[PDB]
């Protein structure tokens, strides 16, 4: 009634997403339609959490939740409209980005991510499809379906968080607790995609393949680097892969400065993972940087 | 610091708040909450029970701001308490998703979702603050224990 549907953007378990027009104001929004009529599936559960979090996360680099409508047997979340995701951008441009666009997107990602962490929210679902891209070059962190607030002492979170290709080694080893460090690993993976052909850095088939592919590139952490590693619930011995494997051929768009940031984001031991705040002060983001 | 102990406070809290309900027991809230946690567990919607000290304190934080002094029936009180519970699960629960059936006690489902939206619009800000501010969590933990 209040919104005219224009065309569907995407559809999954999460719900159907339309481009839409406000009938009153004629402004172009994005509608996520969430069906409530199936009373033995918990899709609403996630939608309500996404609403609680985005109502307290206002920042030009986080998708803006305008309004929530309850009508028919559906929830409708009204989002600002974006041109594409980073997934369709990689497809659009032969996965081959300008080093300044690479630098621009990572910056906007870390601002929106450092904002989340400061507001005590973990995203826990970073991937290109959850990065909304406008034509003017603006990037927004979207999809807080799997996000949760932290601070209250817990036994553990879920280990069944973050899609396999973007999940950090501590979580693959079944870590009970994890901090803001979880999103900083995903940020590293996305950064490597931007800096090559938009292709996933660690595309594993299972948990085992995932940990093998990470240690093969970055090297298997030692007891010096990561003492608690061998005490983690789903820890099993991996080959000692060397720490000498070059990053130059994996991210050939990056100068040594870019590559140094990448290595601070992709430390296996979550405690040593550079934060969003610390990352934004990195030389890679100076106007000095070559 | 025991779950049973903290649930017994919440029930004694609700009975004191809801003056109009003369035939409500401080065990009735406790029975309704435990019953749900069991149902989800035995249906395999979770591995461990949701009802721990921290989450009872969270649920209390909602109830004291959502639950009117003027709730007219035990049935309405249960509908409102379980709406607060459904939101606690969805905000703090370790599972991605939780179903509605255990939490629905109204013939009008429209009413349940309209109420979810109501409580999120009132509480979304303190829902984050109890997690962000340890001082606030302890303030609310204290207040709960002082409800017996
Ligand atoms: C996977 N997950 C699904 C839910 C989705 N979501 C709901 C949410 O965040 O909770 C939003 C929210 C706001 C949105 C604003 N704008 C858009 N725009 C747009 C995004 C892609 C495409 N697109 C990609 C490939 C193709 C085929 O040509 N089209 C075309 C487009 F117009 C989406 C939004 N999604 C976030 C991503």
CA distances from B51 to A9, A39, A182, B56, B93 (A): 39, 22, 26, 6, 10
The atom of ligand 1 lying closest to the CA of A30 is 15
What's the resolution in A?
A: 2.9
Q: At a CB cut-off of 8 Å and minimum separation 6, what does A126 contact?
A: A113, A141, A162, A166, A183, A186, A187, A189, A190
**Burial per residue of A2-33, b for 16 or more beta-carbon CB atoms within 10 angstroms, e otherwise:** ebeeeeebeeeebbbbbebeeeeeeeebbbbb
* Nearest protein CA to atom 3 of ligand 1, as residue: A143
**A287 tagged catalytic:** no
Is-contact B115 B80, C-beta < 8 A? Answer: yes
Nearest to B115 by CA among B74, B69, B68: B68
User: In testing the pocket of ligand 1, which one of A47, A82, A116, A166 has its CB within 8 Å of the most ligand atoms?
Assistant: A82
Angle A228-A232-A233 from CA coordinates, rounded to 5°:
165
Q: Count CB-CB contacts under 10 A for residue A221.
A: 22
Q: At a CB cut-off of 8 Å and minimum separation 6, what does A77 contact?
A: A31, A32, A34, A47, A50, A51, A65, A68
| Residue A2, both tokens | 């209040």
Deposited experimental method: X-ray
Domains and CATH numbers, chain A: 3-80 (3.30.200.20), 84-285 (1.10.510.10)
CA distances from A263 to A192, A227, A279, B42, B98 (A): 10, 19, 11, 45, 38
| Residue A152, both tokens | 């209250």
For residue B109, report the phi and psi dihedrals to the nearest 5 degrees: -65, -40
C-alpha span between B78 and B105 (Å, rounded):
8
C-alpha span between B66 and B115 (Å, rounded):
10
Helix (H, G, I), strand (E, B) or coil at B112: helix
Q: Which helix (H) or strand (E) holds A116?
A: helix A99-118
Is-contact A50 A29, C-beta < 8 A? Answer: no
The partner residue sitting opposite B137, judged by closest CB among A51, A68, A152, is: A152
Q: At a CB cut-off of 8 Å and minimum separation 6, what does A148 contact?
A: A49, A121, A122, A124, A157, B91, B92
C-alpha B97 to ligand 1 mean position (Å)? 21
Is-contact A41 B97, C-beta < 8 A? Answer: yes
Question: From the CA of B29, how many Å to the nearest CA of chain A?
Answer: 22
A56 is in an annotated binding site: no
Beta A28-35 vs A148-149: how paired, if at all?
A: unpaired
User: For residue B98, which residues of chain A lie inside 8 Å, CB to CB?
Assistant: 42, 45
């Amino acid at each position: 009634q209040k919104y005219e549907k224009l065309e569907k953007i995407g559809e999954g378990t999460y719900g159907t997403v339309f481009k839409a027009k406000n009938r009153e104001t004629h402004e172009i929004v994005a509608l996520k339609r969430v069906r409530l009529d199936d009373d033995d599936e918990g899709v609403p559960s996630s939608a309500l959490r996404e609403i609680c979090l985005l109502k307290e996360l206002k920042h030009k680099n986080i998708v803006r939740l305008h309004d929530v409508l309850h009508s028919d047997k559906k929830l409708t979340l009204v989002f600002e409209f974006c041109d594409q995701d980073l997934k369709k951008y990689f497809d659009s441009c032969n996965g081959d980005l300008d080093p300044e666009i690479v630098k621009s997107f990572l910056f906007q990602l870390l601002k929106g991510l450092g904002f989340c962490h400061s507001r005590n929210v973990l995203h826990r679902d970073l991937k290109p499809q959850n990065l909304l891209i406008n034509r003017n070059g603006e990037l927004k962190l979207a999809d807080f379906g799997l996000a949760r607030a932290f601070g209250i002492p817990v036994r553990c979170y879920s280990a069944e968080v973050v899609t396999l290709w973007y999940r950090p080694p501590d979580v693959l080893f079944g870590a009970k607790l994890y901090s803001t460090s979880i999103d900083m690993w995903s940020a590293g993976c996305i950064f490597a995609e931007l800096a090559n052909a938009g292709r996933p850095l660690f595309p594993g088939n299972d948990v085992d393949d995932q940990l093998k592919r990470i240690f093969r590139l970055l090297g298997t952490p030692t007891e010096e680097q990561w003492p608690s590693m061998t005490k983690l619930p789903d820890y099993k011995p991996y080959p000692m892969y060397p720490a000498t494997t070059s990053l130059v051929n994996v991210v050939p768009k990056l100068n040594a400065t870019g590559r140094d940031l990448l290595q601070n984001l992709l430390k296996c031991n979550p405690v040593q993972r550079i934060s969003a705040e610390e990352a934004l002060q990195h030389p890679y983001f100076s106007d000095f940087c070559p | 610091a025991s779950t049973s102990e903290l649930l017994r406070c919440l029930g004694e809290f609700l009975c004191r708040r809801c003056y109009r309900l003369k035939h409500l027991s401080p065990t009735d809230p406790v029975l309704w909450l435990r019953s749900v946690d069991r149902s989800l567990l035995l249906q395999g919607w979770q591995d461990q029970g949701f009802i721990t000290p921290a989450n009872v304190v969270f649920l209390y934080m909602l109830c004291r701001d959502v639950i009117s002094s003027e709730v007219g029936s035990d049935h309405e009180l249960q509908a409102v308490l379980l709406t607060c519970l459904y939101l606690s699960y969805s905000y703090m629960g370790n599972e991605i998703s939780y179903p509605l059936k255990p939490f629905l006690v109204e013939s009008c489902k429209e009413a349940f979702w309209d109420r979810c939206l109501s409580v999120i619009n009132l509480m979304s800000s303190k829902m984050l603050q109890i997690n962000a501010d340890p001082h606030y969590f302890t303030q609310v933990f204290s207040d709960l224990k002082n409800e017996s």
